[PDB]
């Protein structure tokens, strides 16, 4: 395994996952139009949140501690056993909450209580999301990029067929259930691949409870809770300010070019949890840690720069197929956004080192620094430049943040 070998395997699964999302996304827009798209915005966001919440947000800790204790079989069994009990226990509590609160949840997601049966069905679907993501986190701990990629690819195929059968049978609600089955059905190819590759015995998934390990995995639950609250709030108050001096359509072209970056950056960032996180978790000394970080920066910086320049050269083409061609001025924000993507990717290298060391001190400092930098630059550029300023503030944020990550790392290396 290497950074180059893991990136190629993850790129294949990312290419299929992106292409499958565009096929289901276009089929969603063609079948139900703008009325069904706006009515399903909150429900689709919950499905993305369930990819982390349904397993109590311990997946990054599972990969970290599996890679740390892969040598000792008894300790590795306790890691998988405690993780399995934590995922099964939390998802069961999530199913109970979703059933009892089926009417309020449907009211908060759709505005009415006509989707109670769907929410109760989601209570069982989220279990497949939690168990499927846990098995993928186990493969990431062993740096099994091929096994993780094959599971996502096969899962994307059955997820497209499941969405097709669901929407043709259940109509609009079937399509909603189909969107939930797409991440949940990964548990079937992932379970098959975990036993076909023979890296982990199936008996290790037996739920057990190691108290000391559960508390260690709870540190990553707080990390997932912080990252799902700190930065997304900054974007909410950013789009609020952007939509106060301008319209919400100006916000639409700002979030539109952001979805551009969210897709193509996965060709670089998705391999961080597959290789960089398990590798950095095993390294103990500062000399070996610095070697990996420098080697990773020498790889992801030119790779994300060649991809960003390619996206800029195809920004007119990318606006066409990926989004509705509504405002041709959407091409002028790519230059400022792709530059910020290059430095945000470089900042992800130092960020993933914080995950590998389970440092809550450096994690909060990283999220707070990104929050303060975004709000300071948005309060200065958004009211003057509009959506161009929202992309300009994002670029200037990670220009200074990456420089702050490099400066802090230099003081940490020399101690």
């Amino acid at each position, epitope marked *: 395994v290497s950074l180059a070998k893991a990136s190629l395997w993850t790129a294949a699964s990312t290419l299929v996952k992106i292409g499958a999302g565009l096929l289901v996304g276009k089929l969603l827009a063609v079948s139900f139009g703008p009325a069904g798209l706006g009515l399903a915005a909150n429900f689709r966001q919950l499905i993305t949140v369930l990819g982390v919440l349904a397993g109590a947000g311990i997946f990054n800790g599972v990969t970290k501690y599996v890679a740390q204790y892969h040598d000792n079989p008894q300790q590795l069994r306790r890691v998988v056993g405690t993780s399995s009990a934590m995922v099964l226990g939390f998802s069961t509590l999530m199913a109970l909450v979703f059933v009892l609160a089926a009417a309020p949840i449907s009211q908060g997601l759709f505005g009415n209580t006509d989707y109670q049966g769907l929410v109760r069905l989601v209570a069982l679907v989220q279990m497949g999301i939690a168990w499927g993501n846990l098995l993928l986190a186990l493969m990431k701990g062993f740096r099994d990029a091929a096994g993780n990629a094959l599971s996502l690819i096969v899962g994307s195929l059955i997820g497209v067929l499941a969405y097709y059968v669901s929407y*043709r049978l259940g109509g*609009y*609600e079937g399509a909603l259930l189909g969107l939930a089955l797409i991440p949940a059905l990964v548990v079937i190819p992932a379970a098959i691949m975990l036993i076909k590759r023979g890296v982990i015995p199936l008996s290790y998934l037996k739920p057990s409870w190691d108290n000391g390990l559960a508390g260690q995995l709870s540190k990553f639950t707080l990390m997932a809770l912080i990252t799902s609250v700190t930065l997304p709030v900054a974007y909410i108050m950013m789009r609020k300010l952007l939509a106060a001096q301008y319209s919400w359509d100006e916000v639409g072209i700002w979030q539109g070019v952001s979805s551009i970056s969210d897709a193509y950056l996965q060709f670089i960032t998705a391999s961080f949890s597959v290789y960089l996180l398990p590798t950095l978790s095993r390294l103990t000394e500062k000399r070996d840690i610095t070697r990996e970080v420098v080697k990773s920066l020498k790889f992801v910086l030119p790779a994300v720069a060649a991809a960003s320049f390619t996206v800029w050269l195809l920004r007119d083409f990318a606006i066409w197929l990926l989004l509705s061609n509504k405002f041709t001025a959407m091409r002028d924000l790519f230059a400022w956004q792709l530059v910020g993507d290059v430095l945000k990717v470089g900042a992800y290298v130092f960020g993933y080192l914080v995950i590998a060391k389970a440092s809550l001190r450096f994690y909060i400092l990283a999220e707070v620094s990104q929050f303060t930098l975004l709000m300071v630059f948005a309060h200065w550029l958004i009211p003057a430049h509009g959506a161009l300023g929202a992309a300009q503030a994002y670029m200037a944020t990670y220009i200074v943040y990456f420089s702050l990550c490099c400066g802090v790392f230099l003081l940490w290396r020399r101690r």
Partner: nanobody
Amino acid sequence: QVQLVESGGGLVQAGGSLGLSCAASGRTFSNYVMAWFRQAPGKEREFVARISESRGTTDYADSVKGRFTISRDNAKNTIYLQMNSLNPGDTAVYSCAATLPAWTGIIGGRRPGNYPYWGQGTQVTVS
């Protein structure tokens, strides 16, 4: 986008008759799938009837089949519901809904979540 207005509600003795009308606003009314829903005081929405956008195919609930009749007038953008043999159990707020065929699917025509455009609803009381 599509506005719906119900009319014809009132009070009718047990075993009587009453007819509801639902006017829809907007063109391409013939391409829409229309249905009737009711909501008894303190209970959730319940499917009643539904008319198809083609063939005039109808679908009725079990406790309604043989008594209620849904019809469609594409020239007036109006949906009708002739309620015969009215029982006290029929007392509810009857609302009409409009939707497209892709929203209903094959077996999802009786689910209220498959209808995005809803009417306010008129009151029907028996006995």
